[PDB]
Amino acid sequence: APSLTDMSCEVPACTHSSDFGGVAIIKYAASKKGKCAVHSMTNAVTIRE
Amino acid sequence: KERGASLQHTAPFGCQIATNPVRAMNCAVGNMPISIDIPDAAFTRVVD
């Protein structure tokens, strides 16, 4: 699988809006082209993608 | 004859004054509250 490294993040805006009102951006570099899964370790914050 | 100067020449706050109907214009006094609701199509995402 593709492996990331040297990734880091920003949250340009956030709101409590019930319907994915928070938006975030992650910079990265990775070892190849491919498809990559994402998940949140914190149950208090659900991720749409 | 004895008329003096009309308010167009003498009035405070640098205003202009006119008739039909009688109006004062451009009094430089106080402030003007404004609200504007521009369409959401004018924006572009900060992530772009």
Side-chain angles (χ1 to χ4, degrees), chain A residues 8-43:
Chain A
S8 283
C9 190
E10 167 62 325
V11 180
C14 188
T15 57
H16 315 52
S17 304
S18 310
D19 66 8
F20 313 106
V23 62
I25 22 170
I26 291 162
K27 300 183 294 177
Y28 71 95
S31 65
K32 56 171 66 181
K33 190 184 185 91
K35 205 88 172 193
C36 189
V38 307
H39 186 268
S40 293
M41 312 290 81
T42 307
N43 289 333

Side-chain angles (χ1 to χ4, degrees), chain B:
Chain B
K1 289 178 169 283
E2 300 181 316
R3 206 187 305 177
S6 182
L7 296 178
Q8 186 173 30
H9 308 299
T10 77
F13 294 107
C15 67
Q16 279 296 339
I17 286 171
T19 66
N20 295 338
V22 323
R23 288 160 293 128
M25 296 175 288
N26 313 334
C27 306
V29 63
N31 67 22
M32 186 75 98
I34 292 169
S35 170
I36 97 285
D37 180 13
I38 49 176
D40 299 355
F43 296 85
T44 289
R45 310 187 301 169
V46 72
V47 303
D48 301 327

